[PDB]
Design a protein around this nucleic acid. Structure first.
Lengths: 116, 50, 65, 177, 75, 136
RNA sequence: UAGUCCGGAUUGGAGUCUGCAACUCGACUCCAUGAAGUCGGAAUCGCUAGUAAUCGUGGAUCAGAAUGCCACGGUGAAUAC
RNA sequence: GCCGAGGUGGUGGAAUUGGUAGACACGCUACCUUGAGGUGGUAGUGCCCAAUAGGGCUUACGGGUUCAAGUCCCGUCCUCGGUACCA
RNA sequence: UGCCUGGCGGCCGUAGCGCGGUGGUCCCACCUGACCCCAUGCCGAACUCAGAAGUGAAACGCCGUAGCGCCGAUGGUAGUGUGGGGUCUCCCCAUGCGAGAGUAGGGAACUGCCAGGCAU
RNA sequence: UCCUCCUAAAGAGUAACGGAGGAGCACGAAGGUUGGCUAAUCCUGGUCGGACAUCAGGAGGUUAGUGCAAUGGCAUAAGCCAGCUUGACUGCGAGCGUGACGGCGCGAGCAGGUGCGAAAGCAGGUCAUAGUGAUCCGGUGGUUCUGAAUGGAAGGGCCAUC
RNA sequence: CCGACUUACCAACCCGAUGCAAACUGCGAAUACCGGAGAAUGUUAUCACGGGAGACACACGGCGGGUGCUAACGUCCGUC
């Protein structure tokens, strides 16, 4: 149910984002990890992905499921996407409320050089 | 039917007004309604009038 | 909880008149002195005592020899 | 407070020893306790519902939510969106302390008490009892009293059967005639 | 007591499969959404579907409810 | 007389009677009275045939009617001109296609069944036949 | 100053006495209960002084069974243009 | 046949602005007055559940609408008033 | 290269339910508490934060079952365009198209992009 | 006169004193945006409380709901709730649809100035389809546009509106 | 007050099997319609603009219907 009620809040914004054709920055939040993916204009293939389940990100932070890990994941996905070059990305909160951790991920993506 | 015709008149640079309808027995309250004025080209406060 | 709208809810010491003392978070505004307790109640101990429900031949014999 | 730690030792250990639970998560947990006051006579004046709300606020620790009517009924002269009942849903530690005051203090005071009959489970371990007059809780002054103004408390347990929830509530020494 | 009927309001599919449209052309007039908007197709305030780009019209069934969608291929 | 309790609309169109019937198998009972020709039966004729049949068998066995009218038929009064609306609903008919089992009976011998179906078929306007149920 | 420490009907229990016998259907006593009733509609009655009003006592009938009937006293008015 | 109006206690009847009806005048019942009737005066007076507080059933019938129908809508029965003409 | 697990899809019931069994090193879920972010028309239920003692109960995934749901032939039937015929308010013929329902049967999906752990 | 369904023969349209129902409005929120949520009806349990009010759980899955008739729609909700608001904004408008015409409708985008949102974005009224009358004549406000010798003014024009 | 005993009383919802519908539809043609490509044929048969019109009482026959009585050389539509 808790998983099921969230996909509605996803399904609204995902539909119009795929209608526009914008590159979707998808975030995912669990109680102990956090994930980010930069998915193509078609919405099938990803470009990059960064999370706390990556080893090299987890080697440098204390807890894998709080705000600082989210900020490190955001700056990692921003620096990797800027090494690729994805300049205009549109963020999607994926059914999660904005303020808690995906605010930290979104902001650390923004001030690492990603314009949204 | 029961909606009276009223107009709403500009505050700054009144060479303009809009016109709307309002029910007197439910709402005796005023409109202020910050609409656009084409004369002064800004969004001004408008006021209820006959 | 929503901060100021709730009534005060403080730790008091209730004084059970069966002999007992209990710290209880409550709302009464004093140290409440209750009469009977969960201890020493007739239903809780077993002193509920429903009467015989038919003692007629008992009553006739305690009357008459 | 008290009944939580008494649960966390004795109730889980006894429902472990007499019910086959390979995991401790299968043991039923009393999850929430709601006090409902279906006032209902506030179709004439809502001073009465306003008094009943403060009565529930004195009984529990939470400010009660007023419940408006769901569908319009002309059998009882009610309107859609008329506030006709009052409720508290209390969960967690405040529910544990309300459970303390309900068992240790309140249920001796039901004034010719004969034991709450256990057949009031609805099918999935949730209990419901009806307290007929409000003065059985000692938070009421009784110098102030206006009406009788009872309530009903329904306990939601995570039990799936009636016998599991019955053994759960009996492990906290419910009267159970 | 009978005898009243409104004027028929000319609804229906105006442009069918494979037809070349310009942008802004009306494809379907309808009351509800019998057809839903897809790529390069906009939905009006009375649920009119119109060409938001110039191409060819395409009808599909999509989604988990087997619903009709109208797409436009930019030719 | 059989007519629908609480029908949706009071009057309906004339329509046509093309096609072959759907209820061709005798399902409920053993013997059946089946329709050979097209037409329509009013509820008066259905009840006349039913009374004649159950009087012919002396109230033994079981009788099923398999057609129900559900179609209102109007008339205009005499010395009333054409126009001014649809006429008032007078009576209800059931439309009958070739091959429709109109009646069934079970719990009787075959010759009493055949003779009762003859005495009941005398009241009906359409041409009929005697049929028997068949396995598969 | 309350349906109240007013009211004492009703009913549950335990008794006592008379009497062949207290169920139909007695009187009383105890314990408990604590109903209507908050001065009474249209109407209507008695009384002129030791009277009305009020308080108690006694007798006949009678095994038991008076709030009735017949008697006795205590206190004791108002009003008669 | 066509149009308009009506049907509500035992009666005459007011409620025809959806917000749980019979209000008023008769009649009836009870009491008083009277030698006794009538008049007169006080109190009841739509039907069934309990001795009550109250609830069920009730507007010609049947059905729909809504939360709710005497009330608006439809159909049917009965009764009024008007028309049913030109050849 | 093979298993799992998660995210985004493709597709939209041959893909959904029921019934049975199975998983916790990871991943995930339940979980723990609420100085603080934030939240409740009451309530840390949810939303949110700070976390890791337990459990795989529930959920989720996987596997097995046809009891349903679903798909679905070949024939035949209905209907019908065109041109003729009648006993013509209904059909027949020549010819072209040809269902729906039902039947034999199929069937508890398949797969792409990436990420993590495992044995290789 | 207008709207919805059928007649209407699977594009559109299509008559009758053919079969059925509605409209002559409402709403500064019932419009905009952001965030969130998901019914009807039954069963069980529980103070008064009882077929039917409030509570709790289960079944069921949209049989509900839509400001108002019917149809088409709606879960990403167009349904329900709360925060902030005035886009119920001005000038246009590629292109279409529908009418004999008068007319009626849909519209991406552009300029100016805003509202909500962190942002992508969305908003130039409402789930859509009824809620409506041409012209003349005059009323009011603004704009030197004209203004009968000249300067004004009257009166016309234009724009908003009755 | 419980509540027992019954019955040629009726019985919703569900199950199993029949039908019916212009205003029912989880299915669904043939034709017709819209568009594109090609060949042959056709006295441009097509569209636009201008000059001049007439006509706007239709009739029957077939097919699909409404109404009427699946009456009418009836009436009202669609199409030839």
């Amino acid at each position: 149910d808790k998983k099921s009620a969230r996909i509605r809040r996803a399904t609204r914004a995902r539909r119009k984002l795929q209608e526009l054709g914008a590159t979707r920055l998808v975030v995912h939040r669990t109680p102990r990890h956090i994930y980010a993916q930069v998915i193509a204009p078609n919405g099938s293939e990803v470009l990059v992905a960064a999370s706390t389940v990556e080893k090299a990100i987890a080697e440098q932070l204390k807890y894998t499921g709080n705000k600082d890990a989210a900020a490190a994941v955001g700056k990692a996905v921003a620096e990797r996407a800027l090494e690729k070059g994805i300049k205009d990305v549109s963020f999607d909160r994926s059914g999660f409320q904005y303020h808690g951790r995906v605010q930290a991920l979104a902001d650390a993506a923004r001030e690492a050089g990603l314009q949204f | 039917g029961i909606r009276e015709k009223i107009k709403l008149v500009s505050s700054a640079g009144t060479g303009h007004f809009y016109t709307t309808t309002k029910n007197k027995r439910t709402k005796p309250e005023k409109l202020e309604l910050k609409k656009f004025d084409p004369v002064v080209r800004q969004h001004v406060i408008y006021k209820e009038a006959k | 909880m929503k901060k100021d709208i709730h009534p005060k809810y403080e730790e008091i010491t209730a004084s059970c008149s069966c002999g007992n003392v209990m710290k209880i978070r409550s709302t009464v505004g004093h140290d409440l002195n209750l009469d009977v307790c969960s201890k020493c109640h007739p239903f809780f101990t077993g002193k509920q005592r429903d009467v015989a429900t038919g003692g007629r031949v008992d009553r006739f014999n305690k009357r008459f020899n | 407070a008290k009944l939580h730690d008494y649960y966390k030792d004795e109730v889980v250990k006894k429902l472990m020893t007499e019910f086959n639970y390979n995991s401790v998560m299968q043991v039923p947990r009393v999850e929430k306790i709601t006090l409902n006051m279906g006032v209902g006579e506030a179709i004439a004046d809502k001073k009465l519902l306003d008094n009943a709300a403060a009565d529930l606020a004195a009984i529990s620790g939470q400010k009660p939510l007023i419940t408006k009517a769901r569908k319009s009924v002309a059998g009882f002269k009610i309107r859609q969106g008329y506030p006709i009942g009052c409720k508290v849903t209390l969960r967690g530690e405040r529910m544990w302390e309300f459970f303390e005051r309900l068992i240790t203090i309140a249920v001796p005071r039901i004034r010719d008490f004969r034991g709450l009959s256990a057949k009031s489970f609805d099918g999935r371990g949730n209990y419901s009892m009806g307290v007929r007059e409000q003065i059985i809780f000692p938070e009421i002054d009784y110098d102030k009293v206006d009406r009788v103004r009872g309530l009903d408390i329904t306990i939601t347990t995570t039990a799936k059967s009636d016998e599991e929830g019955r053994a759960l509530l009996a492990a906290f020494d419910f009267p159970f005639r | 007591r009978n005898g009243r009927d409104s004027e028929a309001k000319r609804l229906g599919v105006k442009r069918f499969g494979g037809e070349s449209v310009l942008a802004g052309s009306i494809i379907v007039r309808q009351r509800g959404t019998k057809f839903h908007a897809g790529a390069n197709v906009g939905c009006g305030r009375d649920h009119t579907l119109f060409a938001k780009a110039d191409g060819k019209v395409k009808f599909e069934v999509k989604g988990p409810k087997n619903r009709k969608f109208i797409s436009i291929e930019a030719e | 007389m059989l007519q629908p309790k609480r029908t949706k609309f009071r009057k309906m169109h004339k329509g046509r009677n093309r096609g072959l019937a759907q209820g061709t198998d005798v399902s409920f009972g053993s013997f059946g009275l089946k329709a050979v020709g097209r037409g329509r039966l009013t509820a008066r004729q259905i009840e006349a045939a039913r009374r004649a049949m159950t009087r012919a068998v002396k109230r033994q066995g079981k009788i099923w009617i398999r057609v129900f009218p559900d179609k209102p038929i109007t008339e205009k009064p005499l010395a009333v001109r054409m126009g001014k609306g649809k006429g008032n609903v007078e009576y209800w008919v059931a439309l009958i296609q070739p091959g429709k089992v109109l009646y069934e009976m079970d719990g009787v011998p075959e010759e009493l069944a055949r003779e009762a179906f003859k005495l009941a078929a005398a009241k009906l306007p359409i041409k009929t036949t005697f049929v028997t149920k068949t396995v598969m």
